[PDB]
């Protein structure tokens, strides 16, 4: 299903992913589009983060949804 992702900066990217696809799989897709490492990217939906070992269908995500992307520079 076609979904949309919005970064904290305001940028908007349309990403195509299947409910069966895992979150870890989604990050890799982003890597190709945003050129940013999957480890340095964290996604939040409804205020809670998305577990890499979980799938989109498990989060009750329907067609055309807006996800929040945050960047984790370094934990020091």
């Amino acid at each position: 299903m076609q979904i949309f992702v919005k970064t904290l900066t305001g940028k908007t990217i349309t990403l195509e992913v299947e409910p069966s696809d895992t979150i870890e799989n989604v990050k890799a897709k982003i890597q190709d589009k945003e050129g940013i490492p999957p480890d340095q990217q964290r996604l939040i939906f409804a205020g809670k983060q998305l577990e890499d070992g979980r799938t989109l269908s498990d989060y009750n995500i329907q067609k055309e949804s807006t996800l929040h992307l945050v960047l984790r520079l370094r934990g020091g």
């Binding site: 939040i44 205020g47 983060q49």
Partner: protein
Amino acid sequence: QVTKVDCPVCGVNIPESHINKHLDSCLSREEKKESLRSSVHKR
């Protein structure tokens, strides 16, 4: 570089650097409100 970003969880003005720690706390609350469950009684 100095920048700020709102929190999608609680909506609070916070720098892009302090956001990482903030997310760790903001998310912690979510786990506090929800019921506590333990697979094993010991731990």
